[PDB]
């Protein structure tokens, strides 16, 4: 077995953060998603590998609450937001995990996220409106950067945890799906990468 | 300050495991639900300290899947089952979770579970059917054992994780939340203890 399969008992973490028109998975839009793959070394410490990165054309009939997308800062009609249909960046995507599932000896995805069972659920959304099949992804669980930030740094919000861990982080407000993966996969290898460190994976 | 209210920013870890009526947390029945507090000891190790535990009877107009009844061996008609409202069961368990707060000087309480916003969302969703304004728990934020266990002993099964962790988990033939709970504490204390040992938190 990869070294990589073995450490989550055949799961790779890939890191995914969705921007979106609301909370509700069911009816509101997707409108980014970023998604990070995770690699191991040589020496059998994580790192972060290849980011995909989509801003998404709303789907037709979508819900988008107007605070919601204030917020975000999101500018739906700009003429370089280079929005696509996100049957076709999930299939991009897809593909990309399936190659690190080969690569890794790995059997399927694990998303992992900063409260991460919400972009999941968007996710789960997505891949049920597309149809698509063979969704890599774990549908259930999930590996939680608050969760992870609450026991290494006594954090739960994805800043506050990234600043204990020493790394950089903005508090702009304005963030894009891609600055959120990237961050959040520099905390969760991290986290994990201390654990051995400090005896916990020999 | 408190020891705990410095651990995990003023929020005090209450372990919560539901059994249901199916998958869907908006139309499916709350059946049983067990919570049990974290305690932190003189030397700064969790323990699991108080429990709560009520048999529900299902909310008027509930769902309830015959493959959960088959699957957690409950037997709503039972003569001895003791089930009560989802209101009082409710009401109970939180004015103990208050009385855990302050005797440990946090703020609220923050959800600990195996894959744990599936129980939070049970949670909540009886929270709104009810009309209770008084709930001590974080709506959104939990603390998932999946996502712990992956980091300590590459496992997101509850049984798996408990017996890498030298923990006895009997392969049941019926599922029951007490039980889970129980199991849920210990792994959680443990991990979170194991990370102290390790020199993670000084
Ligand atoms: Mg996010
Ligand atoms: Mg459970």
Not at 20 to 30: E, I, K, V, Y
Not at 39 to 60: A, N, Q, S, V
Not at 139 to 153: I, V, W
Not at 156 to 179: I, P, W
């Amino acid at each position: 077995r990869h070294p990589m399969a073995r450490r989550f008992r055949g799961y790779l973490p890939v890191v995914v953060d969705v921007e979106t028109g609301g909370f509700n998975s069911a009816t509101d839009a997707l409108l980014e998603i970023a998604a990070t793959t995770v690699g191991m070394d040589e020496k059998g410490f994580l790192f972060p590998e290849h980011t995909y990165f989509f801003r998404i054309e709303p789907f037709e009939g979508a819900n988008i609450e107007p605070a919601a997308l204030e917020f975000t800062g999101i500018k739906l009609d700009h003429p370089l937001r280079m929005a696509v249909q996100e049957e076709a960046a999930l299939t991009e995507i897809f593909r990309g995990i399936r190659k690190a599932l080969k690569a890794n000896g790995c059997k399927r995805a694990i998303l992992v996220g900063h409260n991460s069972s919400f972009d999941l659920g968007f996710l789960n959304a997505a891949v049920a409106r597309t149809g698509i099949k063979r969704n890599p992804f774990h549908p259930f669980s999930s590996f939680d950067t608050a969760t992870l930030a609450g026991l290494a740094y006594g954090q739960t919000v994805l800043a506050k945890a990234c600043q204990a861990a020493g790394m950089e982080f903005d508090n702009r407000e304005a963030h894009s799906a891609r600055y959120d993966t990237e961050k959040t996969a520099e905390l969760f290898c991290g986290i994990v990468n201390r654990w051995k460190e400090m005896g916990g994976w020999m």
